[PDB]
Structure formats: structure tokens, C-alpha cells
Design a protein around this ligand. Structure first.
Ligand code: SF4
Ligand code: F3S
Length: 106
């Protein structure tokens, strides 16, 4: 599985969804997750994300390991997203700010 990590939050560019062959992204108000059982590890999304938030599971930084289970969890309850949309209004302001997990919206 690939995993969406901290820098997506309050950015949510949604460039990633457009390359995904299997449509395994699920949508929150200010974040995206990947469903780990649906992901085929094609790795195409990783270079697409402007926030560089996406990692191979086996490459998620130690300080962001909690994102692995959180993707799995929220992918069970959020709606599928399969089309690019406009990034969130102040995405530029939040790209690169750390510890945005505190801002995550259910
Ligand atoms: S690795 Fe491939 S299958 Fe998995 S989320 Fe990214 S684009 Fe979709
Ligand atoms: S910011 Fe989030 S919505 Fe996709 S392009 Fe990056 S994982």
C-alpha cells in the first residue's frame, strides 16, 4: 500500500487521484487517504503530489507512522474520490507546515 501523510492536511491538492488506475482514494474535508487493500502499489501517485505527502508504506517516516493505520481506518468511512478538484483555498500557506495532524477534520 501507499500512504498519505501529514503534509496533505489543509493542502489537499487532489492531483494524486488522476493517476490512480484503481480509484483507491477516499475523501475527507481537508485530507485524502488510500485504501490499503485496494492499492496495487503502482507508485504512480507518489511523484504527482505537490505536497510530497505520499509514501510507500515501507518508507513512511518514523515520525509519521501513525498515518499508516489512519489511512486504513478512514478509508472505511470516507467517500471515494476519483476526480481532481481545486486545491484547498490556502494550500500554499500550509504546504510544509509540520504537525498538521492536529488540524485533521473527520
Ligand atoms: S500506488 Fe497506485 S494504486 Fe496505490 S494509491 Fe497510488 S496510484 Fe493508486
Ligand atoms: S496534497 Fe493530498 S490530495 Fe493528493 S495530491 Fe497530495 S495526497
Amino acid at each position: 500500500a501507499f500512504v498519505v501523510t501529514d503534509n496533505c492536511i489543509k493542502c489537499k491538492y487532489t492531483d494524486c487521484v488522476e493517476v490512480c488506475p484503481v480509484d483507491c482514494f477516499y475523501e475527507g474535508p481537508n485530507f485524502l487517504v488510500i485504501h490499503p487493500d485496494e492499492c496495487i502499489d503502482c507508485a504512480l501517485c507518489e511523484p504527482e503530489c505537490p505536497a510530497q505527502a505520499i509514501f510507500s508504506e515501507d518508507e513512511v517516516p518514523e515520525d509519521m507512522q501513525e498515518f499508516i493505520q489512519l489511512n486504513a481506518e478512514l478509508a472505511e468511512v470516507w467517500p471515494n474520490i476519483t476526480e481532481k478538484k481545486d486545491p484547498l483555498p490556502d494550500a500554499e500557506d500550509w504546504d510544509g507546515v509540520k504537525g498538521k495532524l492536529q488540524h485533521l477534520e473527520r
